[PDB]
Ligand SMILES: NC(=O)c1ccc[n+]([C@@H]2O[C@H](COP(=O)([O-])OP(=O)(O)OC[C@H]3O[C@@H](n4cnc5c(N)ncnc54)[C@H](OP(=O)(O)O)[C@@H]3O)[C@@H](O)[C@H]2O)c1
Ligand SMILES: [Cl-]
C-alpha cells in the first residue's frame with residue numbers, strides 16, 4: 001500500500017508528482033499523497049486533492065511536529081532546496097533541512113521503503129559560484145564520473161542519505177539529476193518556461209520584438225532539457241523498479257534542440273516578432289526587465305491574471321545563467337539500461353508548458 005511524502009509540493013517537480021501520483025494507472029498505486037511546503041496552497045482546482053501539510057523543514061521543531069504523525073509514509077520524494085549566496089552556505093542550510101526531514105520520518109514510519117533525492121547536473125559542473133572559474137567534466141555526463149574536488153551541497157545531501165539509510169534495514173534510495181527543467185509552477189525559484197513567458201508577455205504588451213538574450217553557443221549549439229512530468233515519472237519509476245534501487249540516475253528528454261528554433265516557437269505562441277542573434281552586443285534579461293514591475297502589474301490587471309509580483313515569476317538571473325552559457329549534455333544510457341524508457345519531444349513539451357502558464361492565467 002503506497003503512501004508518498006512530496007517535500008516541496010508547490011515546486012516545479014512537486015507539482016507534477018502531485019498531479020501524477022494519484023492517477024488510477026500510476027505504477028505503485030493507488031497512492032496516498034502528503035505534500036509539504038511553507039506557503040499556503042494556491043486556490044486552484046485539483047482533480048485529485050492531496051493531503052497538504054504546512055511546514056518549514058529548516059526548523060527542527062516544526063518538522064518534528066508536522067512530519068512525525070505521518071506514520072503511514074512508504075516513499076519520500078525530496079524536491080526542494082535552499083538558495084544561498086555562497087556554496088558553503090548552501091551546504092549548511094540544505095543539510096539541516098534534509099536531516100530534519102529524515103530525523104522526523106525514519107523513526108516514525110515502520111513501512112518506510114524508499115528515499116528519492118532530486119539533485120541535478122551541477123553534480124558534474126560544480127556550484128553556480130564556480131561557473132567559468134573551474135575545470136569541469138567532459139560531456140556527455142555519465143553517472144560513473146567521480147565527484148569534482150569542490151564543495152557541492154548535492155554531495156553533502158547524498159552522504160547524509162547514505163548514512164541515514166543504515167538506520168533502517170530494507171530502506172533503499174535513488175538520486176535524480178535533471179538539467180534545465182521545462183515545467184509549471186509560479187512558486188518555483190528556478191523556472192525557465194515561466195520566466196520566458198513573462199518576458200514574452202511584456203514584449204507583446206509593449207509592442208517590442210522578442211530580442212534574444214543570450215550567447216551564440218545557446219543560439220546555435222545543441223541543448224537539451226528535463227520535462228517536469230518526465231522527471232516525476234522518473235521518481236515514480238525508481239520507487240517501483242528493483243533495477244532502480246540504490247542508484248544515481250540522470251533525467252533528460254532524450255532529444256536535443258537549438259534556441260534558434262525554440263525562440264521562434266516562443267514568439268509564435270505570444271504573437272510577437274522574433275529577435276535573431278545579435279552579434280557583438282550582449283543582452284541580459286536582468287538588464288532589459290529592470291524597472292518593469294509596474295508594466296507587469298498593468299498586464300495582470302488588464303488581463304484578469306493571477307496576481308503575481310514580477311520577482312516571483314520573472315526569474316531573470318536563472319534565465320540569463322541558461323541562455324548566457326553553453327549547454328553541456330548528459331547521457332540517458334544508464335536510465336535506459338536499468339529500464340526507464342520514458343522520453344519527451346522537447347518542442348511539443350515546450351508548447352504544452354507555455355499553454356499551461358496561460359491556462360492557469362500566469363500570463364495572457
Ligand atoms: N528548477 C530547475 O530548472 C532545476 C534544474 C536542475 C536541478 N534542479 C534541482 O532540483 C532541486 C530543487 O527542486 P526544484 O527546482 O524543483 O524546486 P522549486 O521549484 O523551487 O520548489 C521548491 C519547493 O520547496 C518548497 N520549500 C522551499 N523551502 C522549504 C522549506 N524550508 N520547508 C518546506 N518547503 C520548502 C517550496 O514552497 P514554499 O516556498 O512555499 O515553502 C516549493 O514548493 C534542487 O536541488 C535544484 O538545484 C532544479
Ligand atoms: Cl543542477
Ligand code: NA
Nearest residue numbers: 227229349352
Ligand atoms: Na509534457
